[PDB]
Amino acid sequence: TNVELVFIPSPGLSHLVSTVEAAKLLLHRDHRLSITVLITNLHKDTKVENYTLKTTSNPNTSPRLRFINLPTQEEDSIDSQIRQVREIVSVLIKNPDSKLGGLVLDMFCTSFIQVAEEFAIPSYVFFTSGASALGLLQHLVSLKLEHNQDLTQFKDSDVELSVPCFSVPVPAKVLPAVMVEGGPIEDTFMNYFKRIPETRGIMVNTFYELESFAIQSLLSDAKAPKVYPVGPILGFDQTQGPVGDDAIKKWLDDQPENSVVFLCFGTMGSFCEGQVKEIAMALEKSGNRFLWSLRKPEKGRVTEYENYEEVLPQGFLERTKGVGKVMGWAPQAAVLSHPAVGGFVSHCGWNSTLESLWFGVPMATFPLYAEQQMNAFLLVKEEGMAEMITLDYKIDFKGEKQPEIVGSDEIEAAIRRLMAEESGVRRKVKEMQNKARSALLEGGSSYDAQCLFVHDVINNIG
DSSP states (O other), X not given: OOEEEEEEOOSSHHHHHHHHHHHHHHHHHOTTEEEEEEEESTTTOHHHHHHHHHHHHOTTSOTTEEEEEEOOOSSOSHHHHHHHHHHHHHHHHHXXXXXXXXXXXXXXXXXXXXXXXXXXXXXXXXXXXOHHHHHHHHHHHHHHHHSOOOGGGGTTOOOEEOOTTOSSOEEGGGSOGGGTSOHHHHHHHHHHHTSGGGSSOEEESSOGGGSHHHHHHHHHOTTSOOEEEOOOOOSSOTTTOOOOOHHHHHXXXXXXXXXXXXXXSTTSOOSOHHHHHHHHHHHHHHOOEEEEEOOOOOOOOSSHHHHHHHHSOTTHHHHTTTTEEEEXXXXXXXXXXXXXXXXXXXXXXXHHHHHXXXXXXXXXXXXXXXXXHHHHHIIIXXXXXXXXXXXXXXXXXXXXXXXXXXXXXXXXXXXXXXXXXXXXXXXXHHHHHHHHHHHTSTTSHHHHHHHHHHHHHHHHTO
């Protein structure tokens, strides 16, 4: 009666956490389900081993969740992983005590669809960005494979694409860079995403109310697999809240509700120095209270303070001393959960988008890479739930000097609109916050999508 589902996440703690948190929710929906997660180098990364031991030692998480290590072999290619995944699947399938429900693959692990076919088990995808991203990528793939479109024609173009999962035309300049740059990079991502429509179903880390038009579009394509919006899946205990910082919380406690603008871009130092200067000037002109997570600049000075001074306007740190703080790493989810935080200047990565939404904090969009430009366009132009600093900003690597720097006047104006006490954007975020929390409760859309997914997995095995 037991049905076992094998998950294969892509490497990286972020994708692993979102995969395991998703697995935990699925296990709640049917006692017959068990989940096995195949991990790459379990006993090589501490944060991974600690997390997996934390999960399996806690009986608040069921004994129907387990991990199996994929050790990097002395000769390690994809075929080595293919062979190594083949061997584990053959072992699991020999077990008469449980039925193998299939493989659930990350969007970057779709090559393992061949292994599922070989062992005659269904394949599925856990897509960790949103439905609009999923639909846009399938559209670009169909353009290339079914209509002989040269995707490089869209790079920096002014045309607007008619994309079925967006109700408004999509500017070519918000397309993910990897899909319009040609060469090996286009090949790589075409091979990832063209197999997604060949699985038996796609879990998406979104909720129906956020992206209803895209999901209706995706569900209407009789040639595409069923999609299951099972999110928001967040990297913390969504019933208890995230773990924070005492020092930050103490400072935030001293600020009025919704008065602080949080600026965080992963603390990677992605911006060039001239862009940092413009953000700093905009913060000062705005007069707003702020918390700015900024990677320490490597300017060759002795002290950390001096290194920040090298890239900020002269005297910036002294003049803003009483209204804001420039710091390094910050616990993002915990900061957004604080009632003093009223706005979020963000690169619009999907996890950051869901976390801000979850805590009802509106964003101003400063996308940088991957699908962040599209996420910004979704939030600003399709949903009307964010302020725009820029939609099409793009960096190719950390710190790359940009030919078009966003000026302080444009940033200032966006921050003033963001922090205005009454705004349609703010109201729409609050309405979306309630829907995000309701989606995961019994009777919620995402709760039901999780039940339907487990139900379909059990029945698809026959």
